[PDB]
């Protein structure tokens, strides 16, 4: 019994393409009525899962859901057990809330022996990626046990400021992504870099302008920054934290390779059937999904995937299915999880729209097509960020996905988590 990661020989999942909806999503985020509504708003979700223990984080805003204020940030971990009718869910076992809510930004979780490290960024100038021209660079680690004890005071919660940073040539590092992986006694966190634009070494001749007649050569170089005349260009990567020493807080930034170099976006690195898989959101001209399995971690080189059917929507400047360099910084985070390696099958919640951010639809794509899909809400329900993680329930693969949707009787976009069972039959 229990819940384990993707290891061993699971049950055979369907492989062919069919239209019969064999997917049965089940909501596991039953919230009480909000009678007496107000201008509430929940954003910046977080969901990590590993070896049967999950985490969660959210920022509750009062007012406009983008330019609002902060009231509370619930960051807590818990176990993953069966509700009883052979349906997995996320049971909470510990909850932590910081005192000042307008300090924590861009958290990142990871699993360890009997803890759950949550690496967040501390800033006193607002959101970092919007005001990075004055950020200090301090990073705070939060440890939350997955099984608290009576009167520990040092086992259920422990924080410490990260002092030493091994930044190679950048200026500031920051955790950027939902979750990471473990390698026995080493922790890895997804992150982004901040390099000076003037100190960037990138020849303006490797831009893929094969068939992009209506474009410009320097679009690749201009797209690496949040703005055309920006002062810092982003760079995805990983943060290494070797906790096997504990002599001094170490921060080792592992930059990504130059293959398909895009702007910095929330990245996710997870384990699947022994080999770690990597994901990177598309907040640049390259609107297609950026999947890939990692073969080398210390020097980060990921074998990308040439998927030409799954992408994310955006604005008019850089809409979906765009494969040409254009100066733009927009998109939505929609990841997936590798459920099989022999056939290289993935599964994730992606949006189905050209220039809007509605209609969240669960979909399973092998490499260049969609096998079976299933919608979660109506064709008009809005959605911004989706986080997908898969696990096992004693004989078979299950996937719990956090999909922010617009509830009818709530009038607020609350992060609701579903539960989809991958079937063992086609049609």
């Amino acid at each position, epitope marked *: 019994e229990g819940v384990s990661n993707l290891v061993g020989l699971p049950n055979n999942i369907c492989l062919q393409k069919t239209s019969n909806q064999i997917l049965k999503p089940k909501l*596991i*985020s*039953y*919230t*009480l009525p*909000v*009678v*007496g509504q*107000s201008g*509430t708003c*929940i954003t910046d979700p977080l969901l990590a899962m590993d070896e049967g223990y999950f985490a*969660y984080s*959210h920022l*509750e805003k009062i007012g406009s859901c983008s330019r609002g204020v902060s009231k509370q940030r*619930i960051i*807590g971990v*818990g176990e993953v057990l069966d*509700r*009883g009718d052979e349906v997995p*869910s*996320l*049971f*909470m*076992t*510990n*909850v932590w809330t910081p005192s000042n809510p307008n300090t924590v930004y861009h958290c990142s979780a990871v699993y360890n022996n009997e803890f759950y490290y949550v690496l967040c960024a501390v800033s006193v100038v607002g959101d970092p990626i919007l005001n990075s021209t004055y950020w200090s660079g301090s990073l705070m680690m939060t440890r939350l046990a997955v099984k*608290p*004890k*009576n009167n520990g005071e040092s086992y259920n919660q422990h924080q410490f400021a990260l002092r030493n940073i091994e930044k190679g040539k950048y200026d500031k590092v920051m955790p950027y992504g939902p979750s990471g992986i473990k390698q026995g006694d080493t922790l890895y966190f997804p992150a982004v870099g901040f390099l000076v634009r003037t100190e960037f070494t990138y020849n303006d001749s490797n831009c893929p302008i094969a068939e992009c007649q209506y474009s410009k050569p320097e679009n690749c170089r201009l797209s690496m920054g949040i703005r055309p005349n920006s002062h810092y260009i982003l760079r995805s990567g990983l943060l290494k934290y070797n906790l096997s020493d504990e002599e001094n807080s170490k921060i080792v930034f592992i930059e990504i390779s130059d293959q398909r170099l895009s702007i910095g976006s929330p990245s996710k690195i997870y384990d699947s059937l022994g080999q770690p898989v990597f994901y990177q959101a598309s907040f640049s001209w390259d609107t297609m999904i950026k999947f890939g399995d990692v073969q080398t971690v210390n020097p980060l080189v990921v074998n990308w995937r040439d998927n030409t059917v799954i992408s994310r929507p955006g604005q008019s400047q850089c809409p979906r299915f765009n494969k040409c360099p254009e100066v733009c910084w927009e998109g939505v985070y929609n990841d997936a999880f590798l459920i099989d390696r022999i056939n290289w099958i993935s599964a994730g919640v992606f949006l189905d729209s050209n220039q809007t951010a509605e209609n969240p639809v669960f979909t399973v794509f092998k490499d260049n097509e969609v096998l079976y899909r299933a919608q979660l809400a109506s064709e008009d329900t809005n959605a911004q960020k989706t986080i997908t993680n898969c696990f096992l329930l004693k004989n078979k693969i299950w996937c719990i996905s956090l999909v922010e949707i617009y509830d009818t009787g709530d009038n607020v976009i*609350r*992060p609701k988590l579903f539960a989809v069972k991958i079937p063992e039959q086609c049609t």
Partner: nanobody, 119 residues
Framework: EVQLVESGGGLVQPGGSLRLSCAAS????????MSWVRQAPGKGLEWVSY????????NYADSVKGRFTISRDNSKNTLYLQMNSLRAEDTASYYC????????????WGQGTLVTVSS
């Protein structure tokens, strides 16, 4: 289907002592976790207590750290709460669930129970 049956009333003098019970049926109560949650009109969720499976770990909130203590009666499925020395800031509807605070819940909130502390 999981059925949650709340109990306990309200309209008590300030500083009194009430006992809020909540029984359940369906899932095996012997090995799970229970937590009281409350919400006043105008605010959201806030955990009130927490308890483990074998009545080993017990957690509370900073506002009610020393007010009451949760219990467990695994023999006869129940969930008591011996509230003591309540204040006016405790007038809210209490509920029972299977998660500490979260935004979670693996069953529709059945009826709830209101507790009024005033005059």
């Amino acid at each position: 289907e999981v059925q949650l049956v709340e109990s306990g009333g309200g309209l008590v003098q300030p500083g009194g002592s009430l006992r809020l019970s909540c029984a359940a049926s369906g899932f095996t109560f012997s090995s799970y976790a229970m937590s009281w949650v409350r919400q006043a009109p105008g605010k959201g969720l806030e955990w009130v207590s927490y308890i483990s499976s074998s009545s080993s770990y017990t957690n509370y909130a900073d506002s009610v750290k020393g007010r009451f203590t949760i219990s467990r009666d695994n023999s006869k499925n129940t969930l008591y709460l011996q509230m003591n020395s309540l204040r006016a800031e405790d007038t809210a509807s209490y509920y029972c669930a299977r998660g500490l605070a979260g935004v979670w819940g693996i069953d529709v909130w059945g009826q709830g129970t209101l507790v009024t502390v005033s005059s």
